[PDB]
């Protein structure tokens, strides 16, 4: 998909395997062209904390 | 769980911003979300799609259509992907009233 | 993940087919990474036809047989402004 | 240990190139080396220089 993915190959424990990778955009961006906060992260896919 | 709910969430949040510009309920308003519980863990993501449709009518406040029986997975651009256990699910959709 | 971002932050395609991996280190050097074979076999099962490897990894990848090169046309990196640019020519 | 590991596999192929193969006075130089044990491993080059 054109915006969001690019495919990731990893060494699962069973061989490896072709992940993707998908991001999306959580809120209108210029709701506040010139108010100044930091766009933070919300990472999910039962990660490890490393 | 907590986490399929949560992409669940943004990807409603993004499909609607793209649908509907205007109508900005969804981006601002707290909202409670119930999921009886009784899917077994491994197939408790199952429902996933579910949960996307639900705040979606709770955006344009329109029911679906009736005795509209629906499942399967969803990631972050939705692309539904397969989920197991077809036979029972149909089956005890069947005692329903299941139409669709 | 930074291509997933920065794909993200332009709006722009990602080149078709490309499959990447590699860490990078906050000011863009890039990293050797393990699994280099299976990794490679898995892209080739995909029909992954571009993929791109740290340069400090290459060694390892030329041990491969001539049949699993066959088709994959690799372009070592070190730097990842180079991987930014072609993957978005 | 280690080194341990690494010297008998140069010795041990030697004797398979001895008791079957050509040679009969295996000759090790260091660039014939990466032939006997495979490509070097560790490169461990500072990694930026400027």
Same mark, same amino acid.
């Given at each position: 998909?054109?915006?969001?993915?690019?495919?990731? +190959?990893?060494?699962?424990?069973?061989?490896?395997?072709? +992940?993707?990778?998908?991001?999306?955009?959580?809120?209108?961006?210029?709701?506040?062209? &010139?108010?100044? &906060?930091?766009?933070? +992260?919300?990472?999910?896919?039962? +990660?490890?904390?490393? | 769980?907590?986490?399929?709910?949560?992409?669940?969430?943004?990807?409603?949040?993004?499909?609607?911003?793209?649908?509907?510009?205007?109508?900005?309920?969804?981006?601002?308003?707290?909202?409670?979300?119930?999921?009886?519980?009784?899917?077994?863990?491994?197939?408790?993501?199952?429902?996933?799609?579910?949960?996307?449709?639900?705040?979606?009518?709770?955006?344009?406040?329109?029911?679906?259509?009736?005795?509209?029986?629906?499942?399967?997975?969803?990631?972050?651009?939705? /692309?539904?992907?397969?989920?197991?256990?077809? /036979?029972? /699910?149909?089956?005890?959709? /069947?005692?329903?009233?299941?139409?669709? | 993940?930074?291509?997933?971002?920065?794909?993200?932050?332009?709006? =722009?395609?990602? =080149?078709?087919?490309?499959?990447? *991996?590699?860490?990078?280190?906050? *000011?863009?050097? @890039?990293?050797?990474?393990?699994?280099?074979?299976?990794?490679?076999?898995?892209?080739? =099962?995909?029909?992954?036809?571009?993929?791109?490897?740290?340069?400090?990894?290459?060694?390892? %990848?030329?041990?491969?047989?001539?049949? @699993? *090169?066959?088709?994959?046309?690799? $372009?070592?990196?070190? $730097?990842?402004?180079? @991987? %930014?640019?072609?993957? %978005?020519? | 240990?280690?080194?341990?590991?690494?010297?008998?596999?140069?010795?041990?192929?030697?004797?398979?190139?001895?008791?079957?193969?050509?040679?009969?006075?295996?000759?090790?130089?260091?660039?014939?080396?990466?032939? #006997?044990?495979?490509?070097?491993? #560790?490169?461990?080059?500072?990694?930026?220089?400027?």
């Amino acid at each position: 998909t054109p915006p969001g993915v690019v495919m990731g +190959l990893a060494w699962t424990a069973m061989g490896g395997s072709t +992940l993707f990778v998908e991001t999306s955009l959580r809120r209108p961006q210029d709701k506040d062209a &010139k108010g100044d &906060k930091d766009g933070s +992260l919300e990472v999910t896919g039962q +990660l490890g904390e490393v | 769980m907590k986490e399929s709910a949560r992409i669940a969430y943004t990807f409603a949040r993004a499909f609607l911003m793209q649908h509907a510009p205007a109508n900005d309920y969804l981006v601002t308003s707290h909202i409670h979300l119930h999921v009886p519980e009784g899917a077994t863990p491994k197939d408790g993501p199952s429902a996933g799609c579910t949960i996307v449709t639900a705040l979606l009518s709770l955006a344009m406040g329109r029911p679906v259509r009736q005795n509209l029986a629906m499942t399967g997975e969803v990631s972050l651009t939705g /692309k539904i992907l397969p989920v197991g256990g077809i /036979k029972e /699910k149909t089956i005890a959709a /069947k005692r329903a009233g299941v139409t669709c | 993940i930074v291509t997933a971002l920065l794909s993200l932050a332009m709006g =722009r395609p990602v =080149r078709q087919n490309l499959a990447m *991996t590699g860490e990078v280190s906050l *000011t863009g050097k @890039i990293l050797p990474v393990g699994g280099i074979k299976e990794k490679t076999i898995a892209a080739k =099962r995909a029909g992954v036809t571009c993929i791109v490897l740290p340069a400090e990894n290459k060694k390892d %990848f030329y041990d491969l047989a001539a049949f @699993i *090169t066959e088709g994959l046309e690799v $372009h070592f990196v070190e $730097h990842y402004r180079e @991987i %930014f640019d072609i993957a %978005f020519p | 240990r280690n080194l341990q590991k690494q010297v008998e596999k140069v010795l041990r192929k030697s004797a398979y190139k001895i008791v079957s193969g050509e040679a009969e006075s295996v000759e090790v130089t260091p660039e014939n080396l990466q032939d #006997f044990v495979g490509k070097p491993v #560790f490169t461990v080059e500072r990694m930026y220089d400027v």
